[PDB]
């Protein structure tokens, strides 16, 4: 994707860009259509991640994750 | 370290800037002793200096007791609540007034880790970049290897 | 014993204090703990120097991410935007590709046009005008 | 990229000298302008000394050739008077 | 492949070769060295014509250097000191 | 003179004409005006700057906050003109200087919130086997300011 | 053994051709020397280690004004290896004392007595 | 831009399909490409914590 306007001022000390955005044509669209081990083989091949993400962790570590963290935006 | 103390995020206490701002401490709490001697500085204070800071920041209140609860020390309170508990055990006079202009001068949110130098709430006026940003379109939307 | 310290009470409590998020017999057993937390004093001090090396790569990182998908790279996009005297540094370059994704756009044509510039002047040698974004703005 | 801009008679380092650095941060809203920062006045001692001592050292060879000249000539002023009586 | 006793000491060392950033590298230093021979190949006096004409200031410098290290005496004392010390159990009447 | 098509003959970057400056200055002027009446007719939203501040550079938007680590010989609450922009853009548009835009052109404009210390760091140095243990805790100062406004003039 | 180095008289006779390369003439030679430390003085002798603690060298990369005399130029040439050398050119002349404030030093040797930061 | 909170965080992290012929290819500059893709270093998002990687079908 490439179409922007460049432009040097006129007495050459600060550039002038302009870039209106490219709204997507009407004719590049489609029209809207209308046990324990298995579980983790499952979810994984589901999710495309491997087994190990899936089995749950001791109480240590249970605890020390941050029960209200600081939210930004 | 960081990794044991807590953190939070810059932000201000009201959207402090905005608008005006307004003075986000709320009281100072002396309490100087009349016949001691780590409160020598805080007698000098409260003769010299507590006056003039009065009359500077007129937002605040300041309550001096003598025989304190504790020894000679500072309770600052803020506008959301907080309290910072200072000592000026065996201080001399300037060093209060600077402590104790220090106290004017913040707000009162914990002196915790700040995680960013900086807090914007709408940090994109282009358009925040998702990967169909910069691809290009197709004809009527067709994804590779599809016949039709 | 004459005088003995009653206090050393606060003394383990001041080192200990730091400890207590770790594993183990180190969060209470101050030999221990003394051990750990002077080798995590010395990894903090360490990490400063670390972690302003580490935010430098991931800010190039983004900026060969952002240049590469409008078709140049990150040595020409850096290079070019030197010599139009465009002093932008690389957290604020990877930041607007991330946030604003048309300045930096607008930054990779003119690295790209300055490049083009640089090509045709390099090239052609000799008493030839120079190119307009290549105009260089003296500072005396 | 610093090297080409050896070429140009800029600063190696675009934090160097230049209008990036020497200009001040910051103004009040009213125009007034700011108590100077630091920085530029530990630079300007710097910029100070060095123009000092260009000054001092010109000066010095300047003086040591002037009396270089005056010695060969008072030399042989003193020869062409030990050519007589 | 093992080499006996250590890398790089001994007998059978370890192969060191030298790239091409290397041979550049040392290349501009030897172009910025050949400068210097050039800047030091042309002097501006003689050596009988400096003689003597920093004497005044080396001179001058030195005696700056000696009336600084023969003015090594102790420090004053002063009355109000002691009293201002005994300032340390104001209290207020 | 003439090679024939042949893989290495040609280069494998595509060829490209620069424009001569006559109608390149031309196109130039008319997107400069273009852009000046989209400045002074307000076709503009809010607006974001590349601002550098006391040695780094910022991506400062209105209404927003900067932490700075170290005093500012300043009150709370007294406004201040951020010098040295150096990137000012819109939705539509942007303005960089070489290396910085002009004061008549980019007003942004800031309020010291807070004037605060920083969180009490550690610097310790180890040194094994030769007794090397030093511990110091330094606070830095910081101040903590909000981006009020960011105004452009139509002036190019 | 490794021993103090003299470096013969021949090397330091400028040809024509390096007249014509870098910008210097015979006859009339610059007035003062600009030295800087680009290398460092570890990993040398104590010989050289004392000349760049005694030519004001301390700091890497900070310009250094000497005089052009053989005597300057003799404790140059022991560490002309560690050090770049640029003649401090005029264009005005040596600053008046209410000029030598606002002075500066460009990178191409140049010492300007009139320093503005606003474009020309 | 002006997107929900939920959506616009949806969109910037969400993981794409590549197809990547390998006809007449080496297998290192596939590889290079493919890797460049898993990672997620071809996002501007890209973190090593946040698993940005994206699908790659090299046929």
Redesign the interface.
Request: net charge positive.
């Given at each position: 994707?490439?179409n922007?306007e460049?432009a040097?001022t006129s007495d050459?000390?600060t550039?002038v860009?302009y870039?209106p955005?490219v709204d997507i044509p009407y004719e590049h669209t489609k029209p809207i259509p209308r046990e324990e081990g298995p579980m983790i083989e499952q979810l994984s091949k589901m999710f495309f991640t491997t087994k190990h993400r899936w089995y749950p962790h001791g109480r240590?570590h249970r605890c020390?994750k941050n029960l209200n963290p600081p939210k930004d935006r | 370290?960081?990794?044991?103390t807590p953190s939070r995020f810059l932000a201000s206490v009201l959207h402090n800037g905005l608008g005006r701002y307004v003075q986000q401490l709320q009281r100072l709490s002396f309490s100087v002793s009349r016949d001691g001697a780590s409160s020598r500085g805080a007698r000098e204070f409260v003769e010299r200096e507590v006056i003039d800071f009065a009359r500077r920041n007129p937002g605040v209140v300041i309550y001096v007791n003598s025989r304190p609860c504790c020894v000679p020390r500072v309770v600052a309170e803020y506008l959301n609540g907080a309290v910072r508990e200072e000592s000026i055990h065996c201080k001399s006079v300037e060093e209060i007034s600077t402590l104790v202009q220090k106290l004017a001068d913040q707000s009162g949110l914990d002196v915790i880790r700040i995680r960013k130098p900086f807090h914007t709430d709408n940090?994109?006026?282009?358009?925040?970049?998702h990967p169909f940003?910069?691809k290009p379109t197709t004809f009527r939307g067709l994804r590779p290897r599809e016949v039709q | 014993l004459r005088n003995r310290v009653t206090d050393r009470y606060f003394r383990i409590q001041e080192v200990l204090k730091?400890a207590?998020?770790f594993?183990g017999r180190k969060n209470r057993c101050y030999r221990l703990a003394v051990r750990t937390v002077?080798?995590?004093?010395?990894?903090?001090?360490k990490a400063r120097y670390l972690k302003k090396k580490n935010m430098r790569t991931?800010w190039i990182?983004?900026?060969?991410?952002?240049s590469?998908?409008?078709?140049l790279k990150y040595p020409a996009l850096?290079?070019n935007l030197?010599?139009?005297?465009?002093?932008?540094?690389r957290?604020?370059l990877?930041?607007?590709?991330?946030?604003?994704?048309?300045?930096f756009?607008?930054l990779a044509?003119?690295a790209s046009?300055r490049r083009?510039?640089g090509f045709?002047a390099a090239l052609g040698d000799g008493k030839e005008?120079e190119?307009?974004?290549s105009?260089?703005?003296?500072?005396? | 990229?610093?090297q080409?801009?050896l070429q140009?008679?800029?600063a190696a380092n675009?934090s160097g000298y230049?209008?990036?650095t020497e200009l001040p941060d910051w103004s009040y809203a009213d125009g007034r302008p700011a108590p100077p920062m630091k920085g530029q006045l530990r630079r300007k001692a710097e910029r100070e000394t060095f123009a000092r001592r260009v000054v001092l050292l010109s000066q010095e060879m300047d003086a040591g050739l002037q009396a270089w000249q005056l010695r060969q000539q008072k030399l042989q002023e003193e020869q062409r008077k030990q050519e007589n009586a | 492949g093992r080499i006996p006793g250590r890398q790089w000491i001994g007998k059978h060392r370890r192969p060191r070769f030298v790239s091409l950033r290397a041979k550049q590298n040392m290349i501009r230093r030897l172009e910025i060295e050949a400068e210097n021979h050039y800047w030091l190949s042309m002097p501006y006096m003689t050596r009988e014509q400096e003689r003597g004409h920093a004497a005044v200031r080396r001179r001058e410098a030195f005696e700056a250097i000696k009336a600084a290290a023969t003015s090594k005496f102790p420090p004053h004392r002063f009355i109000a000191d002691q009293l201002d010390h005994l300032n340390v159990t104001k209290k207020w009447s | 003179g003439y090679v024939p098509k042949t893989s290495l003959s040609s280069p494998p970057w595509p060829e490209?004409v620069?424009p001569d400056?006559v109608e390149?200055?031309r196109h130039?002027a008319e997107v400069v005006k273009k852009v000046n009446e989209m400045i002074v007719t307000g076709q503009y939203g809010r607006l974001?700057a590349?601002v550098h501040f006391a040695s780094?550079?910022?991506?400062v938007t209105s209404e927003d906050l900067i932490l700075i680590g170290n005093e500012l010989d300043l009150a709370c609450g007294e406004r201040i003109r951020l010098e040295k922009v150096?990137?000012v853009?819109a939705d539509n548009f942007?303005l960089?200087g070489?290396?910085l835009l002009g004061k008549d052109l980019v007003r942004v404009e800031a309020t010291v919130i807070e004037k605060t210390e920083s969180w009490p760091r550690?610097?310790?140095?180890?040194r094994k086997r030769k007794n090397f243990?030093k511990?110091r805790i330094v606070t830095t100062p910081q101040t903590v300011l909000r981006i009020n406004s960011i105004e452009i003039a139509p002036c190019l | 053994k490794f021993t103090r180095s003299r470096i013969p008289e021949k090397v330091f006779q400028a040809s024509p051709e390096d007249h014509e390369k870098y910008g210097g003439d015979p006859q009339n030679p610059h007035k003062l020397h600009i030295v800087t430390r680009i290398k460092s003085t570890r990993r040398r002798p104590y010989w050289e280690k004392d000349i760049i603690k005694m030519l004001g060298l301390e700091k890497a990369h900070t310009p250094q004004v000497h005089k052009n005399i053989p005597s300057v130029n003799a404790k140059l040439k022991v560490v002309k290896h560690l050090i770049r050398i640029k003649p401090l050119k005029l264009p005005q002349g040596l600053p008046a004392e209410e000029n030598m404030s606002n002075t500066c030093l460009k990178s191409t040797g140049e010492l300007?007595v009139?320093?503005?930061?606003k474009?020309? | 831009s002006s997107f929900s909170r939920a959506p616009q965080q949806w969109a910037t992290f969400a993981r794409i399909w590549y197809l990547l012929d390998g006809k007449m290819q080496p297998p290192g500059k596939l590889a290079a490409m493919a890797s460049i893709r898993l990672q997620g270093?071809?996002?501007?998002?890209?973190?090593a914590l946040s698993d940005c990687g994206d699908h790659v079908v090299i046929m």
């Open positions: 994707n490439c922007v460049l040097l050459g000390r550039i860009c870039h955005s240590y020390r | 370290t960081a990794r044991g940090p994109s006026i282009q358009g925040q970049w940003t910069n | 730091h207590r998020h594993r002077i080798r995590a004093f010395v990894k903090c001090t991931l990182n983004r900026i060969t991410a952002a590469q998908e409008h078709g850096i290079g030197v010599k139009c005297q465009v002093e932008l540094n957290k604020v990877a930041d607007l590709a991330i946030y604003e994704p048309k300045t756009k607008s044509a003119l046009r083009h510039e045709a005008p190119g307009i974004f105009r260089v703005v003296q500072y005396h | 990229g610093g080409w801009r140009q008679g800029l675009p230049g209008p990036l | - | 490209v620069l400056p390149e200055t130039h974001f590349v780094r550079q910022w991506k150096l990137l853009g942007t960089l070489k290396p550690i610097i310790m140095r180890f243990k511990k | 300007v009139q320093w503005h930061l474009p020309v | 270093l071809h996002k501007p998002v890209y973190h």
